[PDB]
């Protein structure tokens, strides 16, 4: 119902909106007498400096640090200093036969990253038929994973296939 | 001479009973109806305040015993002065055994007596079909 | 777990543990008793954990088929993170019923390589289970999981 | 020392109990004007006082269990003597109950000796 | 006379209206702090405008309610307080009233929240049954009776709107060994020769019997048998309708009911 | 034959089982074939027997460890315990972090569900989001309740500044507990609501990081450990006036409730008389320092004014059988309060200074003698003289005061001079003046 | 002799119309200064200074709040008296009522003294 004041205040859209002071602040000072508006020590400092400058993205290491002790993570020659930020080598230590370690080179946190690429796929996997079939089963299992995550999903499926390898 | 284990057990029992007494006195003073009752003239509130003061004396002596046993425990620091907290995570007793065997024999005898008492005590289940 | 049963001469016994789960039985087949014992031990650990810190309620009556649970489907497993630690227990018909897990912060074996380069060493998470091997421990009636839980601060 | 990790304090586990107990009850017993309008206000405070009370209680109990376990693994003779005394008390109570039941059954069967005069 | 809640609501409503109009007028003292993109402050303005509409609507809705107060205020009860200062020392009465109410509310809340106890363990009369039966029988629409022809043990039955009576034969204090029937199908007045048990039904109320047995093994408090039987009878009363069936449709099976938490729903689902 | 279940849903999936009849050279051991179905009028969608059919026998035989019904038991158990988890996983797979099949340390023997890169909140995200991420630590979900329908959340954080003492002091945030229980197999909504709540509250907490000039003088007293509600009490020589801060998803505003901690406090000792206005003014701006300031300033005047009885109608009305009160608590602002007497004579006394107060008339309304308020009888007698007596012509304009306020209040049993004639009643100076 | 609730009912339209007039005069002053600062000599019409209207609105709001609080206090007192006192307005005489009141006051004071003694013994 009270629409005249609304549209009338909306008319004064351009930059010259200052008389509102003389129209309202006398009445406000009359009814309200608050000395406490912003007397406390305060200053606006939005940003000074924000960057890692010390390590890899925190989310990845923080998440992989809580994985099982069955795995072991370390670093290769540093060919992923800034962008990749991870070049990991994992060796499954459990009640099963081990295998060739993965590459584990990830991308930004969107994670469309099939991090291992099997650089030594051909010979190291044609060495024996058993591990060759193991690799084949792994690859067949990987494609069904929608938007897999190298951090958890990839390694988990790899361990699952390696433990199912005994048929 | 020491009875430190029994002392700790008594202290735990005492603090548990203090919590129980708090709950009980809350449940008691929960239904604190109007003292000037229409029908009841001076019956309820008298015994109510009596039990109130009783529970008060009880919790008072409980706090006293708690303080006493705590002082006794914290004073008699005999044995394992370092007391490694990291020594709680793993990776003669002939008279004790004799008393245990005697108690087990008595328990088996009592169990046989109870077994006989079962059959001697049903006594109505078989013949309630025509009992009166 | 307060179950009540009624005997039947020609028919078999019926019973309702807590949720009306009526079942039938036979002449000399009552391993359901042992199953109920295991489940009751698990539920008691749950209750005493809730009594003393306060772990979550992920105590599922089943899971993962650890040891095939021989003994008439006897299977129970729960865990309890008290503070910054985590204890776990399993139950069943002798299928690893004695399962205790306890681990300190500074351990012998770990994988710090991926994180040792970074500062602010995080001895807060819990990677290695490090089972406690609940043998020869001062457990008078197996209900001293709460006594074990007391390993928080002294 | 609000964000600091170390706790610079002492003299607890004794006075804390009585303090927490009397805390949210002094609010009740007070010779002061009580505004006749209030709802969902004191409830927060009493939940807080009972929460801290049961918490410090749990702390004391855990400390007690730790001390008891360390004592047992240190001086098992005390725990053995305690168990022996408990077993003796249990046996005494069992014998007393058995004698009471025997006397009751005796008295019962004795009076109904010749109920049927015939 | 529960209009106090609506009146407190109206109090809160007018307080919020005053606060809102004050804040609206205070915010109009200055424009956009730092927009730099547009004049989107119109959004907050319209929000405050709608808040004013909300306030007006609430005022109207509360004017519609709260019809009127009764004549002769205070109902002549505080006339003593209305009396002269000769007899009035009178405010002490209202003070004690408020104190008693506050203490009662506090004790109730404390007892309620103390339900989560910390007692790790609990260790170191044919006159209460009749009293409990008489107390429970004062309740309406639920008639009870007892004959006890077996002996010291208690034998009793309860009735409801239908003829689906329930036979509950238990010990002195706590309820156990119960059974259910429906529409005189038990006829446990002089069944065969006397008030027989027969532990049976026509294969329909077996589920209800199992539910009642489970409830008996659930409401088994360590003490206070009066509270126990009260909870029992309240649980029983929850079947007076047997029409609704939440979490499903009322066609899932023979029937739907299992309210141990004071709320019924489709059975065979918990 | 076929089996079903309820605990997951009404009838989402059945499970058909049949023994493999005509076993080769075996009158027994029919190999107990198994088949799973995933059909949805009753739908009859494909089943594919997608599970380990029938390698279950080989897996049981290849282990290191009467009827063998345990395998069917195991199957129905794992299905009943995995279906809620996979349902919640497919539900959360629409926002972010669809990491499927993660397991908590393996030895737990339970389906686990973590969370990674929680979505942003509609609240302050410019810089507070960065602080949140700096404080965001590992977080996951597990089963809860009676295992049928209940979910629990577990959150942790970085170093908490508000973390005091006597509350199991620890460097990192110990644990944050959130529980949920749906009705039809929705939790994401309440999850994001609580996330926005804790985000705004953490923004407030980070704003709180500063060094107050004289408030610390009141060893700090903030041992009310912050779980999801920052409480503090360091006023009135002891604990007292505990603040409350939280977001109720029902609206945008917050809830504020004074505390009752402190033995030497009043019967209520709260500010419920003005709690409303303080809550709105706090909702206006999250500058908690302003709240602390106004509370420390108004605690004494409120305590003083609360002494006089306002609830009773003071017997019957002196005019008719109607009922009239004798004081009017008026929380119309943050610190200005307009007390009245017998539905008239509105006294305008309040405090706005850091150590003083001020009194004036409240019935002139910027009109000395020009106009009136057109209402209750204004300007009773001469109040300026009564004020000036206790300081140490038809107008009054802002006479100030300080201790002197308390002296003017708390009715003493001596009516001023009190020669000792009679009167067994404690009358207040303001009360007897109005009378 | 006017009842509180009926007065509030009959006064609601007053607060409504006063708020309406307040908004009206606010818009008047706004368009006045908006034509003054940048337009021409057009708005020559001395309206209300908008102070009196706002003060009147606040005063009416305060009076309504006072009346509502008084009604609430009265009804709450009647309710608690009815709930914690039988009907005795001369089957009991007034002296009996006064005696019962005094006895209840004494019992409350005794309860208070007992709680104070408990708190003292606690310390």
UniProtKB/Swiss-Prot annotation, chain A:
Component of the Mediator complex, a coactivator involved in the regulated transcription of nearly all RNA polymerase II-dependent genes. Mediator functions as a bridge to convey information from gene-specific regulatory proteins to the basal RNA polymerase II transcription machinery. Mediator is recruited to promoters by direct interactions with regulatory proteins and serves as a scaffold for the assembly of a functional preinitiation complex with RNA polymerase II and the general transcription factors. Required for cholesterol-dependent gene regulation. It comes from the Eukaryota. One of its GO terms (cellular component) is nucleus. It is found in: Cytoplasm; Nucleus. Its main location: cytoplasm. Transmembrane segments: none annotated. Belongs to the Mediator complex subunit 15 family. Induction: By 12-O-tetradecanoylphorbol-13-acetate (TPA). This is Mediator of RNA polymerase II transcription subunit 15. The gene is MED15. One of its GO terms (molecular function) is transcription coregulator activity. Expressed in all tissues examined, including heart, brain, lung, spleen, thymus, pancreas, blood leukocyte and placenta. However, the level of expression varied, with highest expression in the placenta and peripheral blood and lowest in the pancreas and kidney. Keywords: Activator, Cytoplasm, Methylation, Nucleus, Phosphoprotein, Transcription, Transcription regulation, Ubl conjugation. Ubiquitinated by TRIM11, leading to proteasomal degradation. It comes from Homo sapiens.
UniProtKB/Swiss-Prot annotation, chain B:
It holds the Pfam family Med30. The keyword Transmembrane does not apply. It is found in: Nucleus. Residues 44-68, 92-127 form a coiled coil. Expressed in brain, heart, kidney, liver, lung, pancreas, placenta and skeletal muscle. Its main location: nucleus. One of its GO terms (biological process) is positive regulation of DNA-templated transcription. One of its GO terms (molecular function) is transcription coregulator activity. GO terms for cellular component: core mediator complex; mediator complex; nucleoplasm; nucleus; ubiquitin ligase complex. InterPro entries: Mediator_Med30_met. Keywords: Acetylation, Activator, Coiled coil, Nucleus, Transcription, Transcription regulation. Component of the Mediator complex, which is composed of MED1, MED4, MED6, MED7, MED8, MED9, MED10, MED11, MED12, MED13, MED13L, MED14, MED15, MED16, MED17, MED18, MED19, MED20, MED21, MED22, MED23, MED24, MED25, MED26, MED27, MED29, MED30, MED31, CCNC, CDK8 and CDC2L6/CDK11. The MED12, MED13, CCNC and CDK8 subunits form a distinct module termed the CDK8 module. Mediator containing the CDK8 module is less active than Mediator lacking this module in supporting transcriptional activation. PANTHER family: MEDIATOR OF RNA POLYMERASE II TRANSCRIPTION SUBUNIT 30 (PTHR31705:SF4). Belongs to the Mediator complex subunit 30 family. This is Mediator of RNA polymerase II transcription subunit 30. It comes from Homo sapiens. The gene is MED30.
From Swiss-Prot, chain E:
Keywords: Activator, Cataract, Intellectual disability, Methylation, Nucleus, Phosphoprotein, Transcription, Transcription regulation. Changing residue 225 to L: In NEDSCAC; uncertain significance. Pfam families: Med27 (PF11571). GO terms for biological process: positive regulation of transcription elongation by RNA polymerase II; positive regulation of transcription initiation by RNA polymerase II; protein ubiquitination; regulation of transcription by RNA polymerase II; RNA polymerase II preinitiation complex assembly; somatic stem cell population maintenance; transcription initiation at RNA polymerase II promoter. GO terms for molecular function: transcription coactivator activity; ubiquitin protein ligase activity. The modification Phosphoserine is found at residue 118. It is found in: Nucleus. InterPro entries: Mediator_Med27 (IPR021627). The modification N6-methyllysine is found at residue 120. GO terms for cellular component: core mediator complex; cytosol; mediator complex; nucleolus; nucleoplasm; nucleus; transcription regulator complex; ubiquitin ligase complex. Changing residue 259 to L: In NEDSCAC; uncertain significance. Belongs to the Mediator complex subunit 27 family. This is Mediator of RNA polymerase II transcription subunit 27.
UniProtKB/Swiss-Prot annotation, chain F:
Belongs to the Mediator complex subunit 14 family. It comes from the Eukaryota. Component of the Mediator complex, a coactivator involved in the regulated transcription of nearly all RNA polymerase II-dependent genes. Mediator functions as a bridge to convey information from gene-specific regulatory proteins to the basal RNA polymerase II transcription machinery. Mediator is recruited to promoters by direct interactions with regulatory proteins and serves as a scaffold for the assembly of a functional preinitiation complex with RNA polymerase II and the general transcription factors. Residues 1-247 are annotated as: Interaction with SREBF1. It is found in: Nucleus. It comes from Homo sapiens. Interacts with GATA1. Component of the Mediator complex, which is composed of MED1, MED4, MED6, MED7, MED8, MED9, MED10, MED11, MED12, MED13, MED13L, MED14, MED15, MED16, MED17, MED18, MED19, MED20, MED21, MED22, MED23, MED24, MED25, MED26, MED27, MED29, MED30, MED31, CCNC, CDK8 and CDC2L6/CDK11. The MED12, MED13, CCNC and CDK8 subunits form a distinct module termed the CDK8 module. Mediator containing the CDK8 module is less active than Mediator lacking this module in supporting transcriptional activation. Ubiquitous. The chain holds residues 535 to 1212 of 1454 of the full protein. This is Mediator of RNA polymerase II transcription subunit 14. The gene is MED14. A motif (LXXLL motif 2) lies at residues 405-409.
């Amino acid at each position: 119902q009270p629409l005249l004041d609304a549209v009338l205040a909306n008319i004064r859209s351009p930059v010259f909106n200052h008389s509102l002071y003389r129209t309202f602040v006398p009445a406000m000072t009359a009814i309200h007498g608050p000395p406490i508006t912003a007397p406390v020590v305060c200053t606006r400092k939005r940003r000074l400096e924000d960057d890692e400058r010390q390590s890899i993205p925190s989310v990845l290491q923080g998440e992989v640090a809580r994985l099982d002790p069955k795995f072991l993570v370390n670093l290769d020659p540093s060919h992923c200093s800034n962008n990749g930020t991870v070049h990991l080598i994992c060796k499954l230590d459990d009640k099963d036969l081990p295998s060739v370690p993965p590459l584990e080179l990830s991308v930004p946190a969107d994670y469309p990253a099939q991090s291992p690429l099997w650089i030594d796929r051909q010979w190291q996997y044609d060495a024996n038929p058993f591990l060759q079939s193991v690799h084949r089963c792994m690859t067949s299992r990987l494609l069904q994973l929608p938007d897999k995550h190298s951090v958890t999903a990839l390694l988990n499926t790899w361990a699952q296939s390696v433990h199912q390898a005994c048929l | 001479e020491v009875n430190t284990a029994s002392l700790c057990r008594i202290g735990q029992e005492t603090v548990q009973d203090i919590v129980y007494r708090t709950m009980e006195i809350f449940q008691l003073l929960r239904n604190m109806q109007l003292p000037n009752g229409v029908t009841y003239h001076t019956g309820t509130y008298q015994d109510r305040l009596t039990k109130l003061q009783d529970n008060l004396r009880q919790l008072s002596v409980l706090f006293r015993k708690l303080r006493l046993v705590y002082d006794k425990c914290n004073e008699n620091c005999g044995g394992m002065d370092p007391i490694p907290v990291e020594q709680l995570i793993p990776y003669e007793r002939r008279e004790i055994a004799e008393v245990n065997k005697k108690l087990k024999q008595k328990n088996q005898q009592l169990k046989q007596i109870m077994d006989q008492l079962r059959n001697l005590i049903w006594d109505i289940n078989a013949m309630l079909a025509m009992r009166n | 777990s307060i179950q009540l049963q009624l005997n039947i001469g020609v028919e078999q016994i019926r019973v309702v543990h807590r949720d009306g789960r009526v079942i039938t039985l036979s002449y000399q087949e009552q391993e359901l008793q042992d199953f109920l014992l295991s489940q009751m031990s698990q539920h008691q650990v749950h209750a005493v954990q809730q009594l003393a810190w306060q772990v979550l309620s992920f105590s599922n009556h089943v899971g993962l088929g650890p040891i095939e649970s021989i003994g008439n489907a006897s299977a129970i497993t729960v865990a309890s993170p008290s503070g910054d630690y985590a204890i776990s227990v399993r139950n069943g018909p002798e299928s690893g019923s004695k399962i205790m897990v306890q681990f300190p912060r500074n351990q012998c074996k770990d994988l710090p390589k991926s994180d040792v380069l970074q500062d602010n060493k995080w001895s807060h998470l819990r990677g290695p289970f490090k089972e406690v091997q609940w043998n020869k421990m001062e457990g008078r009636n197996f209900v001293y999981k709460m006594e074990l839980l007391m390993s928080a601060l002294s | 020392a609000a964000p600091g990790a170390p706790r610079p304090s002492s003299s607890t586990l004794v006075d804390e109990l009585e303090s927490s107990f009397e805390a949210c009850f002094a609010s009740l017993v007070s010779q002061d004007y009580v505004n006749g309008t209030d709802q969902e206000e004191i409830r927060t405070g009493v939940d807080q006082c009972i929460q801290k009370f049961l918490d410090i209680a749990r702390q004391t109990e855990c400390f007690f269990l730790q001390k008891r376990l360390q004592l047992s693994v240190q001086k098992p003779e005390q725990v053995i003597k305690e168990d022996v005394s408990e077993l003796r008390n249990e046996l005494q109570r069992k014998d007393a109950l058995v004698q009471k039941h025997l006397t009751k059954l005796r008295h019962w069967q004795q009076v109904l000796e010749d109920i049927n005069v015939q | 006379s529960v209009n106090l809640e609506a009146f407190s609501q109206a109090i809160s409503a007018i307080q919020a209206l005053r606060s809102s109009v004050s804040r609206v007028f205070d915010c109009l003292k200055d424009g956009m702090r730092n927009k730099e993109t547009l004049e989107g402050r119109e959004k907050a303005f319209i929000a405050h405008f709608q808040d004013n509409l909300h306030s007006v609507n609430r005022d109207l809705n509360e004017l519609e309610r709260l019809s009127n107060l009764v004549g002769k205020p205070s109902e002549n009860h505080p006339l003593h307080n209305s009396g002269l200062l000769s007899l009035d020392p009178y405010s002490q009465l209202l003070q004690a009233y408020k104190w008693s109410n506050k203490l009662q509310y506090h004790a109730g809340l404390a007892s309620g929240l103390l339900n989560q106890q910390s007692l790790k363990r609990s260790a170191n009369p044919q006159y209460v049954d009749d009293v409990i039966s008489r107390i429970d029988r004062m309740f309406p629409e639920m008639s009870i009776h007892l004959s006890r022809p077996n002996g010291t043990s208690a034998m009793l039955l309860v009735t409801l709107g239908k003829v689906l009576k329930v036979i509950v034969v238990m010990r002195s204090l706590f309820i156990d060994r119960t059974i259910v029937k429906g529409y005189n199908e038990n006829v446990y007045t002089e069944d065969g020769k006397l008030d027989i048990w027969s532990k049976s039904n026509y294969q329909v109320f077996q589920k209800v019997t199992d539910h009642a047995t489970t409830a008996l093994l659930h409401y088994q408090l360590p003490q206070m048998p009066d509270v126990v039987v009260r909870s029992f009878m309240t649980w029983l009363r929850s079947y007076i309708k047997l029409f609704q069936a939440p979490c499903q449709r009322c066609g899932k099976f023979l029937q739907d009911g299992l309210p141990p938490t004071w709320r019924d729903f489709r059975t065979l689902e918990a | 034959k076929n089996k079903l279940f309820i605990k997951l849903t009404r009838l989402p999936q059945y499970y058909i089982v049949v023994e493999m009849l005509e076993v080769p050279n075996k009158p027994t051991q029919l190999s107990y074939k198994y088949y799973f179905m995933s059909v949805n009028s009753p739908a009859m969608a494909l089943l594919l027997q997608q599970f380990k059919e029938n390698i279950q026998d080989l897996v049981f035989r290849t282990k290191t460890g009467c009827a063998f019904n345990k395998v069917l038991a195991h199957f129905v158990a794992m299905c009943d315990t995995n279906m809620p988890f996979v349902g919640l996983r497919l539900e959360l797979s629409n926002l972010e972090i669809p990491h499927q099949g993660v397991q908590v340390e393996g030895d737990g023997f339970s389906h686990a569900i973590r969370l990674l890169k929680i979505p942003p909140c509609k609240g302050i995200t410019e810089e507070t989001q960065k602080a949140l991420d700096r404080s965001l630590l590992d977080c996951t979900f597990r089963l809860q309740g009676r295992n049928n329908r209940t979910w629990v959340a577990e959150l942790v954080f970085a170093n908490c500044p508000l973390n005091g003492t006597s509350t199991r002091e620890q460097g990192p945030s110990r644990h944050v507990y959130l529980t949920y229980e749906n009705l039809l197999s929705k939790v994401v909504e309440m999850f994001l609501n609580d996330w926005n709540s804790i985000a705004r509250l953490y923004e407030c907490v980070l704003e709180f990081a500063r060094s107050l000039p004289d408030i610390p003088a009141h060893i700090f007293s903030e041992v009310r450990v912050y779980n999801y509600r920052k409480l503090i009490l360091c006023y009135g020589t002891t604990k007292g006036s505990s603040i409350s801060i939280q977001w109720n998803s029902i609206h945008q505003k917050f809830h504020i409730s004074l505390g009752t901690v402190g033995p030497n406090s009043g019967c209520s000792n709260c500010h419920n008389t003005i709690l409303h206005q303080l809550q709105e003014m706090f909702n206006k701006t999250p500058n908690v320092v302003q709240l602390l300031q106004v509370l420390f300033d108004t605690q004494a005047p409120l305590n003083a004014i609360n002494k006089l009885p306002t609830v009773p109608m003071l017997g019957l009305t002196q005019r008719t059988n109607t009922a009239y009160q004798c004081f009017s608590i008026l929380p119309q602002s943050s610190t200005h309060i307009r007390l009245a007497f017998r539905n008239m004579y509105c006294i305008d006394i309040y405090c706005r200074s850091r150590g003083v107060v001020a009194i004036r008339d409240g019935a002139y309304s910027l009109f000395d003698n020009s106009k009136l308020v057109e209402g209750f009888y204004p300007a009773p007698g001469l109040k300026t003289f009564l004020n000036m007596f206790v300081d140490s012509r038809s107008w009054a304009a802002s006479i100030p005061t300080i201790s002197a306020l308390n002296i003017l209040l708390l009715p003493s049993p001596t009516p001023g001079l009190v020669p000792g004639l009679a009167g067994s009643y404690l009358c207040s100076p303001l009360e007897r003046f109005l009378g | 002799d006017f009842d509180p609730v009926q007065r509030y009912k009959m006064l609601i339209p007053q607060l409504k119309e006063s708020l309406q007039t307040l908004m009206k005069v606010a818009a008047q002053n706004l368009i006045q200064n908006t034509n003054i600062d940048n337009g021409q000599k057009s708005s020559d019409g001395p309206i209300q200074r908008f102070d009196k209207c706002l003060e009147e609105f606040y005063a009416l709001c305060d009076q309504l709040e006072l009346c509502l609080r008084l009604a609430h206090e009265c009804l709450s007192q009647s309710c608690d008296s009815a709930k914690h006192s039988p009907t005795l307005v001369p089957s009991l005489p007034y002296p009996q009522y006064l005696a019962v009141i005094k006895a209840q006051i004494s019992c409350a004071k005794d309860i208070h003294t007992a709680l104070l003694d408990c708190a003292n013994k606690v310390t």
